[PDB]
Every structure is written in structure tokens, then in C-alpha cells.
Ligand binder design. Structure first.
Ligand SMILES: O=C(O)CCCC[C@@H]1SC[C@@H]2NC(=O)N[C@@H]21
Ligand SMILES: O=C(O)CCCC[C@@H]1SC[C@@H]2NC(=O)N[C@@H]21
Ligand SMILES: O=C(O)CCCC[C@@H]1SC[C@@H]2NC(=O)N[C@@H]21
Ligand SMILES: O=C(O)CCCC[C@@H]1SC[C@@H]2NC(=O)N[C@@H]21
Lengths: 122, 121, 122, 121
């Protein structure tokens, strides 16, 4: 139980993370789609003392899409909530910004939504 | 990365102090002028440490969870954007602010907006 | 088969729409949540000649949350795709802007995602 | 609604011509300075026809499907925002641009951004 673990989203991407006691998120991300191969570094933050009223735990993290294999000149941030219990979720919305010229900045940022569970796809 | 590293302010009057590491790390503190926030908060993020040199911006993002040793808003913001270098350096962003909610209220958990940061120099 | 019909999202809201031959969307929306009661007018647009390569049909619509019962001083736009076939979907992301003072404009706009099907909840 | 009704231009140089009806309707045409677009496109939307009078903006939104009698981009944009009246009238928006995609490519279907419109007067 908790944020720390291996998570998978609806695309089949793999999010491996450790939640530090005082709010750090640290791990790796492997995307099933896009200009990406293998694992990328991620860092983020989470609320390390959530409310005690049934609310989720706010969090977010970033991946810059550069590793030893590829550089897509882009970065994604995920913002969302962890929802605990017997079917633990992380429900997110994300912003993927590509480096562009200023004139093309209007088309620099994709938006979407990812839902993560600890269930490995089969 | 001397470009990104420094002190920045946005249109709301918020203060972003950041260091860009050789490995692509962003670390620093954020102080918001608005919202359920006081003092400085930890931020962490990532940037493209080997960006295109064809006139394109440098992609980056960072997160603040709105808990510090004074206050906890039970929320987190992520900024996604690009650094545009030169003498009038800017970081242009869009952001998502998610509050912890009950499941019934999750539909109203996330605000969206845009911040432009100017480097103090 | 088609966009015209009665749709329901994951919240249990009801979206009743007619797709005009040349791109109009016209109908009503009833939200299961929020500062809303009964039906509200909606209008929007869709691509009335979609690609023939398996792509979805782009569309969007707006509701201003004023009717004879309530006025929330807000408006939502949904932007997304219709995906036809034997389990027809409308997959959307939305922006809900409330009227605010300029100083509070930073907190004026909620974002989320709704998926619609023609299956009435039970 | 004389306030909203008129001709507006955004920071890209796009042209928004709109009429606000007594019933809350928005109707008009949009011409984009950028993207897979030429000439005018139909728009339709809605606004709050009885807004607060406490200093708040007037909520509104509209849609353009990027098909006209010259071109079809297989895409649609919605703008969600508020009208701020007075002598320096503005419509401040965020937008979502969804392109039709295959199901496999749906993750990359939607762009987000922000436009500010100034009324020509
Ligand atoms: O193509 C790129 O610029 C890099 C890869 C982006 C993959 C995106 S991030 C949001 C979405 N969720 C995923 O797991 N993968 C895609
Ligand atoms: O109210 C909260 O939940 C915490 C503070 C949020 C402040 C937001 S983050 C996006 C925007 N940019 C800022 O500098 N401040 C606001
Ligand atoms: O509370 C308001 O300001 C008016 C009602 C908003 C309801 C929102 S629109 C997006 C989401 N999808 C729905 O079916 N209902 C909520
Ligand atoms: O490229 C397309 O799919 C059609 C044209 C899109 C133009 C976009 S809509 C949001 C932004 N604001 C504008 O005035 N133009 C761009």
C-alpha cells in the first residue's frame, strides 16, 4: 500500500516511483508511445500529510524526454491524485511541451489524461 | 545551465528560484503571490539538457506540492513549458493545479492556467 | 449510428444532441454534478466530412450554465472526437470557466475529461 | 449584448467576428492567422446573458470546426473564457484543439493554449 511502487497506465507505460517521507517523488518512466525508448528520469512532489477526510493525495511529476538513447526535445508534467484502498489509482492530467520556435509556440503543448494502477498488463 | 539557473518572477508576482543541473535536474523554491500558500515551497523538475540549437526553446517542467513547514493546502501544481534564452529570457508555461478531493468531487479537482516568467538580471 | 442521439458520461450527465448535415451541433445538456439543475442549451460544431482512414470525427460544444432555474455564472466547452463502430464513444477534454474578478482569473478555469456513450446508466 | 458583439483580434493576428444574442447565443466567424486554416470558419457558442454585476467577467465559450468550403483540417477548437468589459474590453480564453486521430494516436490528439482578444473599436 502507498505511492511507492510500479504503476502502469492505459497506454501500457511503466511508472516506477519512490515516495520519500517528506514529499519527494523519484523514479523512472518508460512510455509505450511517442518519441521515447527505454527509461527516463522523473522527479516530482506529493502531499506527505494528506487530509483525513477521504480525499486523495495530490501529486505531480516531470519527465524530460532525453536519455542515453533518444532526445525528443520535450517534457511532460503529470498533475493528479493518488487514491488508496483496495484498487489503488493515480489519476492524472498531463501537459507535454515540445521545444518550438516562438512563432510555433501556439502548437507546442499537448494535453491528456492518464490513469495508473499497479496491475501489469497481460 | 546558467540560462535557466536564477531568480524569476511571474505576472502574479510569484517568485521561482531554480538551479539547473548538468544532468537535467531542476531544484529550487517557489513562493506564490496567490492562493492557499505562504513562504517558500520545494520544487523539483527536469529540463532538456541538450536542446535543439535551431531557434527552438528548451523544454522543461517542475512540480510544487503545496506543503511546507507552515502550511498545507493539500494540492500540487505542475508547470510545463519552455525556456526562451537571450537577453530577454523568458520561461513560458501552462500549469495544472490538482487539489486532493473526495472521489465524488474529483471532477472539480484540477485548475488550468498559464504563467510567464521573467528572469531577474 | 452517428453523433445524433442521447449520450451519457461517466458522471451520469445526459447530452442530447442533433448533428446537422453541414457541421452544426445543437441540443441540451443536464449535468449530474455542480451548480446545475435540469437542461441547459448547448451549441457546437463537428467535422461533417471526416477522414476515411479510421480517424475519429473532431467536434466541440459549449454550455453556458444559465437556464430558467439557476445561473452559475460559468460556461464549459468540451473538445474531442467521436469514435463510431459497435461501441460508439465521444471522448472529450473540457474547460469550465467561471466569471471572476481579474485578480482571481488565475483560479477561474477547471479542466477535466468526459467520455460519453449511448448506454443509459442503471 | 453590445459588449461582446463586434470584431476582435488575438495575439496571433486571428480575427473573431461575433454577435451575442439576447438568448445567450454566440454566432459568427473566425479566421486563424496560423495552422491548417484559410478564409473564415463558422463559429457557434454560448455566453452568460445575465452575468454578475459585482466586478466579475462574463463567462462564455465557442467552437470552430476547421472545415469550410475551401479547406478541412479534420479538427475543432473550443475556447472557454470570460469577457471583461469597459473601455479596454478583452476576452481572455484558454482553448483545446482536438484533431481527429486513429485510436492508437488519440493520446496526441489535443493541443492546449491561451488566447487574449482585443476588441476593435
Ligand atoms: O513524444 C515525445 O515527445 C516523448 C514521449 C511522450 C509520451 C507521452 S507523455 C503523456 C502520455 N502518457 C504516456 O505514458 N505517454 C504519452
Ligand atoms: O491554492 C493552492 O492550492 C496553492 C497555491 C496555488 C498557487 C497557483 S500555482 C499556479 C499559479 N501560479 C502561481 O504563481 N500561483 C498560482
Ligand atoms: O458548477 C458549475 O459551474 C456548472 C456545472 C458544471 C458541471 C461540469 S461541466 C464538466 C463536467 N462534466 C459534467 O457532465 N459535469 C461537470
Ligand atoms: O491547424 C488546425 O487544425 C486548424 C487551425 C487551428 C488554429 C488554432 S485554434 C487555437 C489558436 N488560436 C488561433 O487563433 N489559432 C490557433
Amino acid at each position: 500500500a502507498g505511492i511507492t511502487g510500479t504503476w502502469y497506465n492505459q497506454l501500457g507505460s511503466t511508472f516506477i516511483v519512490t515516495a520519500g517521507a517528506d514529499g519527494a517523488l523519484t523514479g523512472t518512466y518508460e512510455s509505450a508511445v511517442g518519441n521515447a525508448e527505454s527509461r527516463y528520469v522523473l522527479t516530482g512532489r506529493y502531499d506527505s500529510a494528506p487530509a483525513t477526510d477521504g480525499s486523495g493525495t495530490a501529486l505531480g511529476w516531470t519527465v524530460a524526454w532525453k536519455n542515453n538513447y533518444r532526445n525528443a526535445h520535450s517534457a511532460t508534467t503529470w498533475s493528479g491524485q493518488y487514491v488508496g484502498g483496495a484498487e489503488a489509482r493515480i489519476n492524472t492530467q498531463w501537459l507535454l511541451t515540445s521545444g518550438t520556435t516562438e512563432a510555433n509556440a501556439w502548437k507546442s503543448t499537448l494535453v491528456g489524461h492518464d490513469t495508473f494502477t499497479k496491475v501489469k498488463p497481460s
